[PDB]
RNA sequence: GAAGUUAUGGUUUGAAAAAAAAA
RNA sequence: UUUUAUGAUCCCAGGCUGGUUUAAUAAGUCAAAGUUUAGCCGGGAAG
RNA sequence: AGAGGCUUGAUAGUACUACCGUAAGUACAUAAUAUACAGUCCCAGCAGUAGCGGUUAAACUAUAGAAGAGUCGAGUAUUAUCCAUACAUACCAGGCGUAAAAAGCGUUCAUCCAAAAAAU
RNA sequence: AGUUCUAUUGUGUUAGCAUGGUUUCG
RNA sequence: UAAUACAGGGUUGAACUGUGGGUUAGUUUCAAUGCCCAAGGCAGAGCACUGGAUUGGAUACCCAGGGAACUGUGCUCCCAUUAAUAAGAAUCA
RNA sequence: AACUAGUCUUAAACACACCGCUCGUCACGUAACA
RNA sequence: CGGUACGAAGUCGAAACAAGGUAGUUGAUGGUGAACCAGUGGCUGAACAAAAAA
C-alpha cells in the first residue's frame, strides 16, 4: 500500500482500534 | 499540459494510473476543506500522474467548488462529485454525488 | 559625467534589544506564579483520614501540603485531575489521562522556567511534551470526540479539530503554545517581526535610538476565534449569502488557536 | 584449456619475458572449474565488478 | 566510492566446493589429465560433504 | 581536507580581508565607469534549418518539453 | 512490502544452516512460493519471527541472488507482454502479485494477468528497474 | 579520574593510534564480510630488500 | 557545498554577505535574526 | 499475544558537552544509556560483589 | 460540445487581495 | 471572506500533435524527452 | 591511374540486419615497400590530452621519396549542431570517513513511507 | 514507545560554605 | 563535581494504555570565542603600545610594564560549530 | 657528553630525493570583470 | 578605483612541509613593506616527555 495521503487513510480503516 | 507517447500509453503503469483517475461519469472523489458558504463545498481531491522516466507515481491535490443542494457536507467528510459542465455562479463547477465518510459531529 | 559625490553612511543606527513586557504582561505572569504557587488544604501522596489518626498533630502538620515540596504538591494535582478524568481507579495512561498528566507538567515546568530563567534545557523540555500532548490530543480526537470535547472543556484548554490536516501557514497553522492560553494570556500570539514586518526604531528617554527585535505584546482580544454574528449580505465575501449557521453565531471554528492574518503564534519562553 | 578450466596469474620479474613466464606458471596454478552447462548456453546474464571495473555478459 | 560495504552481496563469495571426484572427473572428460588408477575407487567411495556437517554445530549457552 | 590544500584558502581569505581594511578607513565612495550574445543564451534556439520560423517552437527551443 | 525487502537479507545469507527475519503474512507467502520451487529447505512461524532452513549444493546455497524490483516506495506493474519481454531468456524465478495469489512469472504468463513484479531470484543480471 | 571537559574525535590513522588504548584489526563482522583463511591469495607484492627487488630463481 | 564551501574558504562570502554575528568589518544585519 | 517492539527513537537527541571552558553538559549526562545497547545482564556479568549493598535506598 | 491533463529556463529577492479603521 | 511553499500575488521567453523501416537474443508498439509533405487551432472594422 | 580527398609517430577491433568454421580472384603470372632517404634545428613548425623539434626526426617540410604504403571513393576532408558512444543526466545507471558532499545540537507543520502488502 | 508511582541521582539553574593557587597586611 | 531549593533525563519494577510512528519547513528554543552594547573596574594574567636584549634587520620569538577582551534571561550563531562518519527498520545467542 | 659508518623506530607536502620542496610584497607586459 | 587570471623571471626576506628550527591551522579581531606576528576560544589536518603499590 503506497499512497497514504490523507484521503487514503480516512478511507483505509477497519476499526477505530488497531488491536 | 503533459502528453503522452503512443507506446507510453500501454504500459501497465500508466493504464493502472489512468484507471486509478477515471470513474464512471468523470466523478472524483475528496474531502470536504470550506463548507461555510450555503449549498456549497470545496473538495480536496486525489490526483496521480505517471512518470515515465523514474517509473513510479506522485499524488498531488485538485480543489474544485460543488453544489450541495442540501447541507450534509461538513468540513473533514469524504464525498463524491460529479461535474456539470457549466459554472453556477462563480465558484461551483461540479454537484455532490453521495458522502462516503462522515466526520462525527456534536 | 554628472553625479553626486557619495559618502559612507553618517547617521545613527539604532541599536538591537530586546521589547520589554508590559504592565499587563508583567501582572498576568505574576498572576500565574501565585496561582501556581497556591497551596490547597489537603494532605500529600494518599493519606487520609485513619492513616493521619495514628500520627500526632504536629506529625500530621508536617505530612499536611503547606510543609510539602513543590514536587508533591505537583503530583497532587496530578493526582486530582487523574481522578477527575480517569476510566477506573487506577487508570493513568488513557489518553484523557494523559493529556491532564501531560497539561499539568507543562504548567508546572512553565512556572519553573518563569523562576529560573536562565535553564535552558527545560525550554527543550517543554518544547518536547508540548509536541507530545498535540500527538494525545490528535489521537483522542479520532478515537473518542465526545470525551475530547468534554476533556478540553475540563481543562480550559482550546478544542483544537484534526479533521482535514493542519496547514502550512503560520498565520492558519495550530499552535499547542496557544493550547491552555486560558490561564496564561501572554501565550496567545503575536505580530509579525521579520523584514518588512520588523518593529521600527524608537528614541528612549535617555536619548538614543533603540529597535526591538519584536513586536511588544499586546493583551488580545477576547474575542480571539470565537464564532461571530453575521448579517445577511450577498457579496464578494459571501458570493452566495450567509448560512442560519453564521447569522446565529453557532458555527463551529476547528482551529480555535490560528495566529491569524498579521499574527504569529506565541514565543516558546520569553 | 578452453573446456571449462581456466585461471589468471599475475607475476614479477626482471624482463618482460621472465616476468610472463612466472604470470604464466602462476595462473597455471589458479587454474579453476568453471560451472558451464553440456548445452553451451548461459542460464542468465552475468555481471561482474570490482570497484570501476564492470564485465558483462 | 567504497570497498567491501556490500553486505549480502559482492563481500562473500558463493562458490561451489569441489572435491577430489569432481574435480578428477572435470579433467578426465576435458582431457587435460589421463586417468589415475585411484580415480575408480575414490569414485566408488565418493567424499562425504564436510561442510553440510560443519553448518550442524551450534552455540550452546554455559 | 588537508593542511596543504588549507594553505591556499588560508591566503586568498586573508588578502580580501586585508584588503577590505585597507579600504576602510576612507569615507568618499570611489566613482567608476554588447552586441555580443552569451553561450547560455545561444543553447536556448537552434540554428537547424526546419521549416520557416526561426525561434517560435519547442522543436526550435531547448526548453523542457512536457512528454 | 517493508517486511519483504527485510526478508531478502535473511534469504540472503551464506555459511549459515538458519536464518530469521521478520514476520508478515506477505513473507509467509513469498516463504510458501520459494519452498514450491524448491529453494530452501524450509521454514518455521515464530510469534514476531520468522526461521528460514536455507538449502544448500556443493557448499553454495540455492539462491546466489535476490533483486528486489518493488520497493514500497514504488510499484512496478507489467502487462502479460511486458513480463514476457522482461523474463526472456532467462531461467530465474520472478514473484508476482496479483489477484489470484503470489505466484511465479511463468504461472502469471500462462494466465495472461497483469501482476505486479517483487523479486528476482537467482534471476542473474537481469533488470530494467 | 581527571576532568578534561570533553573528549577529541581525531580522524587519521596515526592520531587514532596514538590516542587510543589499541587500534588492532578486530574479527570481521559474519553479517558483514566473510572470515579471514589460509587458502586467501597473498597480496601481489614484488619482493624487495633495501628497495632492490629480488626476482631471480637462481 | 563544493561550491559552496569553496566560495567560502576563499573569502568571497565573508565580504559580500551580512551577517548577524558582526565583526568590525563584516557587513552587519540592521534587522531582527531569524534562521534562513 | 504477538506484538512488535517499539522503535528505539527518543527525543531531545543524544548528549552533548558545551564547546569552550565551561564543562557544562549541553544535554543530558555521563551515565545516558543509549536506547541501541546491550542488556545490563549483558554488560555487567558478574552481577553484585559480595560485599555490595543488597538494599540501595539511603 | 464535456472531463482529465507533472510545467521549463532567466539564481531569485513570500505573502496578495477583500473587509475594518483613518481622515 | 478568498488564494497561498502542492508555489498564491506577480515579470520576460517560447502554438501543440503524428510519421510505418529501424541490425545487437536492445523488443511484440524504438521504450523518460530529438522528425519531415500532415492533424487541430490561430478576433473585428466601407459607419 | 579507369579519380580524387584524407592519413602515412604510438593509441581505438575497425561493429552490428541473410549466412553464423560446411569455402576457392584455389594454383600460375607473383613477390614487396618507408622506424630507406633528403631539407630545418627548442628555429621554422606540428599535434587530440599526453607530446615531437637541442644540427643523423617512422612526430615539422618534401611522394619523380618509386609504377611507394592504408582507407573511402564521385567523392573526400575541416568547422559547427546533439539526448556529444558508459565526460552513464546515474529509474535501469554515480556519490557524501580519508579524495566534492550529513545541516551546530534539537521541537514540530505539510508531504512521504511503515504496521491488516494484492483485493475489498 | 507514552502516563502514574517507586529506588537512585558527578545532568541544568540555584541563596549561602569548607577548602585552596595568587595577590595582600604585619 | 559537599549540603540545600527547583526542574529534567537515564536505569529497574508494578499498573495503566492499545500501531497512538519514522523522517521533518512558509517553524523556532538553545548554542565557544571574538565584535557591537551594557555593566562594573583595578585578585590574577594579558592585544595595541612603551623600553631591555639577539639579529645586516627585525614591526617577533626572550625580559619588565601594560586603561583592549576575561562572569550579561542583550545583540547574537561566523567556524577545524559542540559524542564522532544524519535519523529509523532488518540481519547476530 | 658529543662525531662518522651503519642498524632500528617515528614524521614527511622530499622522490632530480634538504645544494629538496616552498610563501608573499614590490617591479614587469597581455587581458576579463567591475 | 580596489581586487583578479595569464608570461617573465628581477629585488627583499624565509612563512609552511622534520619538533621546519616559536607546532600547525581556524572564528572574529589588533598590529605590521612582504610572507606574517600577538592575545583569546576552537580543532588535530601536531610534536616532546611520560607512573607499578602504598
Redesign the pocket.
Known amino acids: ?6 484521503q487514503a ?1 480516512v478511507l ?1 480503516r ?2 477505530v ?3 | ?3 503522452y ?4 500509453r ?1 504500459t501497465a503503469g500508466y493504464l493502472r494510473t489512468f484507471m486509478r ?1 477515471k470513474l464512471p461519469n ?1 466523478e ?1 472523489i475528496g474531502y470536504v476543506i ?1 463548507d ?2 450555503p449549498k456549497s463545498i ?1 473538495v480536496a481531491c486525489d ?1 496521480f ?7 513510479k507515481t506522485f ?7 460543488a453544489h450541495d443542494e442540501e447541507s450534509e457536507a461538513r468540513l473533514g467528510d469524504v464525498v463524491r462529485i460529479q ?4 459554472r453556477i455562479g462563480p ?1 461551483k ?1 461540479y454537484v455532490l454525488v453521495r458522502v462516503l465518510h462522515k466526520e462525527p459531529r456534536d | 559625467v554628472a553625479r553626486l559625490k557619495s559618502h559612507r553612511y553618517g547617521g545613527v543606527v539604532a ?5 520589554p513586557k508590559s504592565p499587563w504582561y508583567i501582572e498576568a505572569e505574576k498572576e500565574f506564579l501565585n496561582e501556581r504557587a497556591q497551596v490547597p488544604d489537603a494532605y500529600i ?1 494518599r493519606w487520609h483520614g485513619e492513616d493521619l489518626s495514628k500520627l500526632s498533630p504536629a506529625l500530621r502538620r508536617c505530612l499536611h501540603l503547606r510543609c510539602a ?3 508533591e504538591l ?2 497532587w494535582r ?2 486530582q485531575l ?1 481522578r477527575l478524568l480517569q ?2 481507579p ?6 484523557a ?2 493529556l491532564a ?2 497539561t ?2 507543562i504548567l ?2 512553565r512556572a ?1 522556567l518563569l ?11 517543554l ?6 500532548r ?3 490530543m ?2 483522542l480526537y479520532r ?1 473518542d470526540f465526545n470525551l475530547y470535547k468534554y476533556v478540553c472543556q475540563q481543562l480550559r484548554i482550546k478544542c483544537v479539530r484534526f479533521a482535514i ?10 499552535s ?1 503554545i496557544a493550547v491552555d492560553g486560558d490561564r496564561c494570556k501572554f501565550l496567545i500570539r503575536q505580530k ?1 517581526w ?4 520588523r518593529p521600527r526604531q524608537l528614541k528612549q528617554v535617555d536619548g538614543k535610538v533603540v529597535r ?2 519584536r513586536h511588544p505584546m499586546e493583551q488580545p482580544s477576547s474575542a480571539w476565534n470565537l464564532p461571530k454574528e453575521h448579517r445577511p449580505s450577498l457579496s ?3 458570493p452566495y449569502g450567509v448560512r442560519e449557521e453564521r447569522l446565529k453565531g453557532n458555527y463551529v471554528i476547528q482551529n480555535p488557536t490560528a495566529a491569524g ?1 498579521g499574527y ?1 503564534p506565541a ?4 | 584449456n578452453g573446456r571449462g578450466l581456466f585461471g589468471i596469474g599475475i607475476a614479477f620479474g626482471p624482463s618482460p619475458k621472465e616476468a610472463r613466464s612466472n604470470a604464466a606458471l602462476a595462473a597455471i596454478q589458479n587454474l579453476d572449474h568453471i560451472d558451464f552447462d553440456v548445452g553451451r ?1 548461459l542460464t542468465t ?1 552475468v555481471h561482474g565488478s570490482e570497484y570501476s571495473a ?1 564485465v ?1 555478459i | ?2 570497498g567491501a560495504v556490500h ?1 549480502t552481496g559482492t563481500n562473500f563469495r558463493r562458490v561451489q566446493r569441489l572435491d577430489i571426484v569432481d574435480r578428477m572427473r572435470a579433467l578426465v572428460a576435458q582431457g587435460l589429465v589421463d586417468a589415475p588408477l585411484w580415480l575408480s575407487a575414490a569414485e566408488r567411495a565418493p567424499p562425504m560433504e564436510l561442510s553440510n556437517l560443519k553448518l550442524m554445530d551450534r ?1 550452546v ?1 554455559n | ?4 590544500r ?2 591556499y ?11 577590505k ?3 576602510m578607513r576612507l569615507k568618499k565612495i ?1 566613482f ?2 554588447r552586441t555580443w550574445k552569451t553561450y ?1 543564451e545561444t ?2 534556439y ?3 534549418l ?2 520557416g ?1 526561426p ?13 | ?3 519483504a525487502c ?2 531478502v ?2 534469504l540472503l ?1 551464506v555459511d549459515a544452516l538458519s ?4 514476520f ?3 513473507n509467509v ?1 513469498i516463504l510458501d512460493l520459494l519452498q514450491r520451487e524448491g529453494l530452501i529447505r524450509g521454514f518455521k512461524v515464530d510469534g514476531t ?1 520468522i526461521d528460514i532452513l536455507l538449502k544448500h549444493y556443493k557448499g553454495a546455497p540455492v539462491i546466489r541472488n535476490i533483486r528486489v524490483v518493488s520497493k ?2 514504488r ?1 512496478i506493474w507489467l502487462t ?3 513480463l ?2 522482461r523474463t ?2 532467462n531461467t530465474g524465478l520472478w514473484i508476482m ?3 489470484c495469489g503470489v505466484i511465479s512469472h511463468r504461472d502469471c504468463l500462462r494466465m495472461g494477468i497483469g501482476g ?1 513484479m517483487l523479486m528476482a531470484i537467482n534471476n542473474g543480471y537481469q ?3 | ?1 581527571p ?1 578534561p ?11 587514532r593510534a ?1 590516542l587510543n588504548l589499541s587500534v588492532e584489526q578486530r574479527q570481521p563482522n ?2 558483514r564480510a566473510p572470515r579471514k583463511s589460509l587458502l586467501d591469495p597473498p597480496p601481489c607484492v614484488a619482493p624487495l630488500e ?1 628497495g632492490n627487488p629480488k626476482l631471480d630463481r637462481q | ?2 561550491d559552496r ?1 569553496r566560495k ?1 574558504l576563499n573569502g568571497t ?2 565580504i559580500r554577505r551580512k ?8 557587513r552587519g ?1 540592521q ?5 534562513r | ?1 504477538v ?31 543509549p ?2 545497547a546491550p ?2 545482564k ?1 554488560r555487567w556479568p558478574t552481577g553484585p560483589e559480595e560485599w555490595a549493598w543488597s538494599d ?3
Open positions: 500500500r503506497l499512497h497514504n495521503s490523507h487513510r483505509r477497519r476499526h482500534y488497531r488491536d | 499540459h503533459w502528453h507517447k503512443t507506446w507510453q500501454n483517475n468523470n472524483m470550506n461555510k458558504h470545496r490526483r500522474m505517471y512518470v515515465m522516466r523514474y517509473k499524488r498531488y491535490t485538485k480543489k474544485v467548488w461535474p456539470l459542465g457549466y465558484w463547477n | 541599536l538591537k534589544t530586546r521589547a501522596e515540596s513543590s514536587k505537583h503530583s496530578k493526582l487523574c476510566r477506573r487506577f487508570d493513568t495512561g488513557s489518553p489521562v494523559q498528566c501531560l499539568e507538567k508546572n515546568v519553573h523562576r529560573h530563567f536562565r535553564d535552558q534545557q527545560k525550554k527543550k523540555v518544547s518536547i511534551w508540548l509536541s507530545r498535540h500527538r494525545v490528535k489521537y478515537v490536516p493542519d496547514s502550512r501557514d503560520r498565520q492558519r497553522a495550530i499547542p509579525l521579520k523584514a518588512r514586518f526591538f527585535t464578494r465575501a459571501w492574518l504569529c514565543p516558546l519562553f520569553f | 548456453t546474464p564492470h558483462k | 566510492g567504497k553486505y552455540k549457552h | 581536507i588537508s593542511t596543504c588549507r594553505r584558502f588560508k591566503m586568498r581569505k586573508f588578502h580580501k580581508k586585508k584588503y581594511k585597507k579600504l570611489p567608476v565607469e547560455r543553447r536556448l537552434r540554428k537547424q526546419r521549416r520560423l525561434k517560435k517552437g519547442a522543436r526550435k527551443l531547448r526548453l523542457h518539453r512536457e512528454r | 512490502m517493508q517486511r527485510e526478508m537479507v535473511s545469507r536464518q530469521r527475519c521478520p508478515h503474512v506477505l507467502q519471527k514500497p516506495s510499484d502479460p507482454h511486458e514476457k519481454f526472456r531468456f502479485q496479483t489477484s505486479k533488470h530494467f528497474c | 579520574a576532568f571537559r570533553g573528549i577529541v574525535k581525531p580522524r587519521s590513522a596515526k592520531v596514538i559474519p553479517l633495501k | 557545498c563544493s564551501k567560502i562570502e565573508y551577517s548577524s554575528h558582526r565583526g568590525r568589518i563584516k544585519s534587522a531582527p535574526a531569524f534562521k | 499475544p506484538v512488535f517492539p517499539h522503535t528505539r527513537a527518543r527525543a531531545g537527541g543524544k548528549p552533548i558537552m558545551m564547546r569552550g571552558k565551561s564543562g557544562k553538559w549541553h544535554w543530558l549526562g555521563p551515565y545516558w544509556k536506547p541501541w542488556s545490563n549483558a540501595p535506598t539511603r
